[PDB]
Amino acid sequence: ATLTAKNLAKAYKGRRVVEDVSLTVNSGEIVGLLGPNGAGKTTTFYMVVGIVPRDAGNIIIDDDDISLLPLHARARRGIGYLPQEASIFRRLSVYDNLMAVLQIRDDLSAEQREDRANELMEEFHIEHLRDSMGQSLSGGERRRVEIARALAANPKFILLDEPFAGVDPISVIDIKRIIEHLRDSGLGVLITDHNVRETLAVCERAYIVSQGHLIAHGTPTEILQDEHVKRVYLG
Amino acid sequence: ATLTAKNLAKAYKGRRVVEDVSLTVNSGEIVGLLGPNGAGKTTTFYMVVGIVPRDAGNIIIDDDDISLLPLHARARRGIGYLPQEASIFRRLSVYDNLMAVLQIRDDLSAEQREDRANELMEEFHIEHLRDSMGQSLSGGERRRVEIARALAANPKFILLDEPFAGVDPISVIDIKRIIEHLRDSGLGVLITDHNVRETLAVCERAYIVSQGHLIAHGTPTEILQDEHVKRVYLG
């Protein structure tokens, strides 16, 4: 199983932000999409998961062609999406969000589902918040719950969009352990982020976009040490 | 030229979250508030600026009993705020937001506001985003706009809650440079994020909270030299 994106394109109202950027995630490979501010990284994610009408491109897994499938029929097959924006349920509780995503996993028993959710709540150090609702939280708790219910559905491959926004550097390490555990268990994670020091520590290959130009792609050591990456993105 | 918070306490519907983190901010100072999630950070900013009520509290700018004064009165007395959540005027534009903050200051002139908006668009690199709609931004793009928006009101004191949420490191360097410029211009700043290696790298001193208790204090040198921060927050 290998998800591959081909030749993506978008021009919002004349402003072109995506111009022929083709990415790939293999069978269980942590892939980076690190780029500067406003560089269409979520816009690439929009087109890959099929939120918006792209101009031209191909989202082909090469065992399926999902170039014009909707949001769900490519995510029903195992391609998960995590929104950058604050996308938690607003009124349901943490246990409610987790068990509502896990209600839809119709391949287990509900006791095993609740045991899975107890693994989740113990796992993200959030289990004391079983009672609190969605908007009765803050930024870190919302990100931990969003990642928890997104990883709860267990797609074949997942596209993360700044999971490390407003979280303390210890839960970053927790999510690092969980991402590496699931990559060992066969999940190919694509991620954009801006916490560079704790982002490059987990990656395996790194598509590096700028304006619609893939200015680098390689091992995170030479991604750190490239003089054009240090020109465009690091400084 | 001096502010000191006191006696701060809040109980969100029975459960207490803050117990007397009495902080201090003075003019010409860059202050941090690092700590884990749920540690009364945003709650403390709410109790200072006026978004929530309190249990006890004493807010004095050199003589001031603005401690019971409401949200708009405290922001007139000179405390500036930036929200954790994304807080942009949606249907406007970036120039519209900056000029609309400049319309609140009815003490400057109609040319000075244009000059200041031009300076801020040059510094935050958002000149090519001047045409962009408010809700048509993307994450850290919008956060740079919101930082420049807090700057544009220009009070004597500014309290910043996660201004480094998903922003590119070159613009982090630029925002840190502007905060150093305003500190050299004589302003008081209370920042918090979870960017350790750039939040401590700018702060004159910092506060360390944990679950409502100010479990440490001091200059970021001895914050790094503190053993208990890796025990709770740093890692």
Place this chain on the structure above:
Amino acid sequence: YLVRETLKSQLAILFILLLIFFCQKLVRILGAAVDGDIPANLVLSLLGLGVPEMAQLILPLSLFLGLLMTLGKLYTESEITVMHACGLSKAVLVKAAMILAVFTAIVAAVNVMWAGPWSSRHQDEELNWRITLVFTVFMMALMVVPLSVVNPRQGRVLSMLPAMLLYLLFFLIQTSLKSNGGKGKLDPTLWMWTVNLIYLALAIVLNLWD
């Protein structure tokens, strides 16, 4: 599971529209009558004297309006694009709207049929149209769900205006087709049971989207 959210906004909009004019019109009788005349069965009559047919029609109105408010304030909080990101469908929202729409259809049946003796007595002193209300409440709960796919990008009343406008162009034509003939076994042009199934395909072609 958003049925509590739709039912909450549903009761909100029904409460607003239940106040909005006839509470003034009940004030105009009762509030001056503590010095003028104090009966029970004059001020008590204004319920069935003012709101049989407004309460008959106001439930598809508050129905589609509250569902549009709730589902729009799921898309603009960007959360049904997480529900729908978990391999869901619009049809699960259609089933949720069907649960809400049968909760609204039973209130429709209450405020026509069982109060029929009460309404007929306290007003008097088309049965095709009477059974139109099942699909009249099913159509808009079927129809708001695709049109309110609108996002935080340009989300405004460019869908709320067709949501009201199609309610209008349906309902005034339904009253014009009820206007012909007469009452009971009097036979008009038989098209009042056709036009709702005509708009069935209108609520289907912009919904199924193949």
Place this chain on the structure above:
Amino acid sequence: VLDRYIGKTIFTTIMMTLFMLVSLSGIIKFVDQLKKAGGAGMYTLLSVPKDVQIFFPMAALLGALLGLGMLAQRSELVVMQASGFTRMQVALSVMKTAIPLVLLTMAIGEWVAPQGEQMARNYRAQAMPDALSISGLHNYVKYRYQLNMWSKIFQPLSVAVMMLMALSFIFGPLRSVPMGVRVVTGISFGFVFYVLDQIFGPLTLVYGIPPIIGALLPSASFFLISLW
């Protein structure tokens, strides 16, 4: 300009909810008058000009307390206040698009509301409210309602004040506000505050009062007690 921003948002939501109320109350009376009487054009054109004068002060609350609710949902009004602004948004922003828009109704209610339903009065010959100038009450009371239509004429000050007092329930929120629970109680709050305002007409002229301050009787007190 934030004044232009909140003016444009409330100025469009007032049009949308105004269309909802007006173009629903037309089809209220249309169906049962076509059931009773035995050409929709002049029926609608008679229903509309004495509904856009009626429901607009009852749609300002489903305007500036719903569109501003969606505005406050994104946490923007707190940033307005935190950037140096105050309660001045209510009066000096929302009235900037209220008093032209209710100035429309107080012009229509003389120009083409009464005389524009007078064509329906003319059409009553083919078919099967105390609204006149200042000279009507002079020989109406002399031969009662001692200038009770001072309220119906100079409504828009109290029409402003009934939402000036109610809008503090939305720009003073609790932040644990789902808004579909609380702004409807905030609307029903001020719902009686322009209706019990009116049913208390004879409550001060039951002993005798100059109608200048006898058609203002809780309205002068509402914005007095409601400044925050």
